Amino acid sequence: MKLSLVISTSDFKGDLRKGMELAKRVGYQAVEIAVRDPSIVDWNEVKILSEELNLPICAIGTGQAYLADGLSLTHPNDEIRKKAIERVVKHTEVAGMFGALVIIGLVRGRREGRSYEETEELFIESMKRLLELTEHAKFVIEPLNRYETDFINTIDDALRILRKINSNRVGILADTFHMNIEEVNIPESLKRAGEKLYHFHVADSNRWAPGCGHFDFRSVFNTLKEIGYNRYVSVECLPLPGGMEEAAEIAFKTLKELI
Amino acid sequence: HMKLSLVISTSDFKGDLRKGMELAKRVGYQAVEIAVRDPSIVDWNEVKILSEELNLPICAIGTGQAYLADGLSLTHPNDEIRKKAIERVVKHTEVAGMFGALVIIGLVRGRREGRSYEETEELFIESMKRLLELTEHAKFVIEPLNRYETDFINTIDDALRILRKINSNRVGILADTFHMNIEEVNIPESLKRAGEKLYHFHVADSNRWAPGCGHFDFRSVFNTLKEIGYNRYVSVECLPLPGGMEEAAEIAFKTLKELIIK
């Protein structure tokens, strides 16, 4: 089981450097980044930087491609959906340089007045298209709470869709903040996810640094040990309390104590 | 002496109301809670008759749809709309007066809308004081809501700050477990800070399903409620899950009843 830190960067080199150096200084084993459009960033420097600090990049976020450019893998407009798929393909090329996972969060899109079934099938089609367009890329579907989406809110929802995609290149990314709302019994949900649990995000009930809310992290980590989770636990929380740096330190401290 | 109430969903009405109230009575609830967009289009004398026939008081009236449907806000940047919001709420108080019910100030307070928290809060305090000058018996409860529903008054402390500025015992707090599960650091401690200001309470599990179908820690909450002497209403406001409206209300009642009696 490894700890990583999600670092926020502008739409960049400055924020990345600072973030990675902070992660190294605190003790994180890896870092996780999030970029809207990767084609404008020079990843060769990124790799150099990474190699320099001996700090791997575990995953690449794609949420902004949706929040900023409105790209969706279930967009009703086919030309837009095609562009969404092509954008994610570029995310995988970046991920391939570091052997990282590609996060499929809000980029999957919402029902937008359509049935759950039509949305799901369109999503499955796009995912299959991505699996065709890329050879080794690995994707992780992140169930999000009801306020952020009406498509894939729970781990069980994700599992059912994974069975329809039928590929070990697609797994699940569970997030404690979102599970706090959507999951009935978190430990049991994780056990059902089992080996399909590819990545993990941590933040407290208020989305602050772990240890600053009331989320039960102990039970979570006991379950993760029980199922033999040997992948990444990435800190993805608001810069609270006291800012980005303090939050990272606090989160690392409480999580380390439990691992 | 805590009492149990059920929030009943009503279309924007008699049909839904009667079925909801009869359900509450059959399950054992001591009162119901309703929500109406505009009270002016409802014959409330028929409602009172129904309440009397079923011996089911109406402990609180929601006003959230006044915002969600009519866009009325007590902190709206357009003073014209702000006045209308106040006028709409006054009508809710007139209805509340017929039942001795509390008026809930939820989403009707509005959002920051790109403004500072200080200005929004000042506008709100001004609207609440106006509401108090306009009413002689109405009692209001401010309900903190999670970040996704609003950026104005998310925690019990936010409300407490506002209450001290309003300085009126006719305004109190309505805390909701589903919302607290997100916004409050430590729920028991939050409730102790509210103390006597806690006028009404909403209950729903972490997933907003009937209490007992999530992972929210209700035991600790009720221990604190006892410790603080809360003796008013605990109203169930959850999604009709699992199994529907009736099943959810039944499960909710059973969960709460056992917590109380013990």
Side-chain angles (χ1 to χ4, degrees), chain A, chain B residues 2-262:
Chain A
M1 185 171 256
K2 300 158 293 183
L3 291 168
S4 58
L5 201 233
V6 176
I7 53 174
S8 56
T9 57
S10 296
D11 181 9
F12 172 88
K13 296 163 189 171
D15 298 327
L16 186 64
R17 293 171 176 293
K18 181 187 296 177
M20 299 189 149
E21 299 192 312
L22 168 69
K24 187 68 175 183
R25 177 169 59 270
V26 174
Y28 287 103
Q29 288 151 288
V31 71
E32 182 178 314
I33 59 178
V35 293
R36 177 184 62 77
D37 175 23
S39 65
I40 58 176
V41 182
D42 171 21
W43 300 103
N44 296 142
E45 285 187 300
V46 181
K47 183 180 176 181
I48 298 299
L49 175 52
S50 176
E51 298 173 298
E52 181 185 307
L53 306 172
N54 184 50
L55 188 66
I57 296 182
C58 64
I60 308 300
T62 67
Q64 286 302 308
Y66 174 80
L67 292 180
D69 307 323
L71 297 177
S72 167
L73 299 179
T74 57
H75 198 296
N77 188 316
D78 286 60
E79 70 189 56
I80 306 299
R81 197 169 67 252
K82 180 191 174 190
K83 277 182 167 63
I85 294 178
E86 302 182 315
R87 174 70 65 78
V88 177
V89 164
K90 307 198 199 308
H91 282 287
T92 71
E93 304 187 326
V94 175
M97 285 174 231
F98 309 102
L101 301 167
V102 177
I103 298 173
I104 297 294
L106 281 175
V107 73
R108 63 173 171 278
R110 294 159 185 158
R111 289 176 59 176
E112 297 304 325
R114 299 166 299 182
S115 68
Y116 196 101
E117 291 68 35
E118 195 197 330
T119 306
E120 186 178 299
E121 291 309 317
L122 200 57
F123 175 64
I124 290 169
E125 291 169 42
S126 294
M127 290 309 301
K128 284 183 177 296
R129 177 61 184 176
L130 284 174
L131 296 171
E132 297 176 50
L133 292 174
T134 60
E135 297 180 58
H136 315 296
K138 183 171 298 171
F139 309 86
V140 297
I141 299 176
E142 175 175 35
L144 299 171
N145 69 253
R146 67 199 62 182
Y147 288 111
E148 297 197 32
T149 183
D150 51 22
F151 179 52
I152 305 180
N153 294 298
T154 68
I155 284 178
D156 291 317
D157 280 359
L159 290 171
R160 191 174 58 71
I161 292 175
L162 291 182
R163 284 191 278 285
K164 292 197 176 184
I165 294 171
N166 195 42
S167 168
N168 65 193
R169 295 174 61 198
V170 182
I172 294 169
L173 159 48
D175 180 299
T176 56
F177 173 75
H178 294 297
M179 293 195 293
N180 187 213
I181 300 170
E182 303 305 337
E183 304 296 326
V184 173
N185 185 301
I186 291 163
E188 301 188 309
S189 288
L190 298 181
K191 286 174 178 168
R192 288 197 291 284
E195 292 171 294
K196 301 291 170 52
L197 182 61
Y198 287 11
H199 200 226
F200 202 66
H201 274 184
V202 169
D204 222 304
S205 52
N206 50 185
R207 211 201 274 120
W208 289 20
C212 300
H214 56 73
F215 183 79
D216 177 10
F217 289 104
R218 289 187 66 75
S219 287
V220 161
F221 279 77
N222 279 318
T223 299
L224 289 172
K225 293 213 201 76
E226 286 167 27
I227 69 174
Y229 189 76
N230 69 337
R231 298 151 187 177
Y232 286 101
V233 172
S234 201
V235 176
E236 204 286 77
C237 67
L238 295 176
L240 261 42
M244 179 194 80
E245 299 213 309
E246 173 156 53
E249 306 182 315
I250 293 172
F252 184 81
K253 189 171 190 173
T254 88
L255 297 172
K256 183 183 181 179
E257 248 226 64
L258 297 175
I259 65 172
Chain B
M2 274 185 251
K3 293 155 290 186
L4 292 176
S5 43
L6 173 73
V7 174
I8 54 187
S9 175
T10 57
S11 304
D12 188 81
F13 174 101
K14 327 201 301 231
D16 292 337
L17 186 63
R18 173 161 274 183
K19 292 172 186 172
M21 295 177 79
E22 299 190 322
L23 167 69
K25 200 200 192 313
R26 172 170 60 255
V27 173
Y29 285 99
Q30 292 153 300
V32 293
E33 184 178 316
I34 58 172
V36 297
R37 175 179 63 75
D38 180 7
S40 69
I41 62 175
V42 172
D43 184 316
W44 297 99
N45 302 309
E46 291 175 57
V47 175
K48 202 179 74 175
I49 265 62
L50 183 57
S51 180
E52 304 175 310
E53 302 184 322
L54 295 176
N55 185 35
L56 264 181
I58 294 174
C59 65
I61 299 181
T63 64
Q65 281 301 312
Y67 174 75
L68 291 172
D70 305 329
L72 300 186
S73 161
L74 295 176
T75 63
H76 200 287
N78 182 345
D79 54 11
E80 165 57 37
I81 297 183
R82 213 150 69 227
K83 293 187 188 304
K84 280 180 173 173
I86 287 169
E87 287 158 5
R88 169 68 60 83
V89 179
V90 162
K91 295 189 176 181
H92 278 101
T93 64
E94 304 179 324
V95 172
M98 295 176 64
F99 300 92
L102 293 157
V103 172
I104 300 169
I105 299 306
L107 290 174
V108 74
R109 61 175 174 271
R111 297 164 182 153
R112 288 178 57 180
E113 294 302 328
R115 303 168 297 188
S116 65
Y117 191 102
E118 296 92 310
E119 164 176 27
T120 307
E121 180 186 286
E122 277 183 52
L123 272 47
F124 182 60
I125 291 168
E126 187 180 318
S127 289
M128 289 306 304
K129 289 179 169 189
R130 182 67 180 182
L131 249 25
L132 292 174
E133 295 177 308
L134 276 43
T135 58
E136 305 176 318
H137 310 290
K139 302 215 291 188
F140 311 83
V141 292
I142 299 175
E143 172 176 26
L145 299 171
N146 67 258
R147 67 200 60 184
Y148 291 111
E149 310 211 354
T150 181
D151 49 9
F152 181 47
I153 309 185
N154 294 123
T155 67
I156 287 177
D157 293 328
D158 286 336
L160 290 173
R161 279 203 310 290
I162 292 178
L163 297 187
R164 285 189 284 284
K165 295 185 175 306
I166 294 172
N167 192 45
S168 175
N169 63 183
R170 293 171 55 210
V171 183
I173 299 176
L174 162 49
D176 181 304
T177 58
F178 170 81
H179 291 292
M180 285 191 299
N181 182 215
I182 302 172
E183 305 306 333
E184 303 302 327
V185 174
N186 184 292
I187 295 175
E189 281 295 320
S190 293
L191 292 178
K192 292 188 297 181
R193 298 201 290 282
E196 65 191 57
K197 309 303 184 176
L198 187 60
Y199 283 16
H200 198 55
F201 198 68
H202 267 180
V203 100
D205 220 308
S206 53
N207 46 4
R208 212 156 195 180
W209 285 15
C213 298
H215 55 70
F216 184 83
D217 176 12
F218 287 107
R219 288 186 178 64
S220 296
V221 165
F222 278 89
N223 280 320
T224 302
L225 294 180
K226 171 58 164 50
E227 188 181 305
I228 188 55
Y230 189 74
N231 288 148
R232 300 192 177 294
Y233 290 102
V234 171
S235 188
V236 174
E237 183 183 59
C238 65
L239 295 171
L241 292 172
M245 187 182 106
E246 293 186 57
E247 189 183 314
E250 285 161 43
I251 294 169
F253 186 88
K254 288 183 183 180
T255 301
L256 300 172
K257 192 61 183 177
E258 195 167 84
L259 287 159
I260 294 174
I261 59 65
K262 315 149 94 294

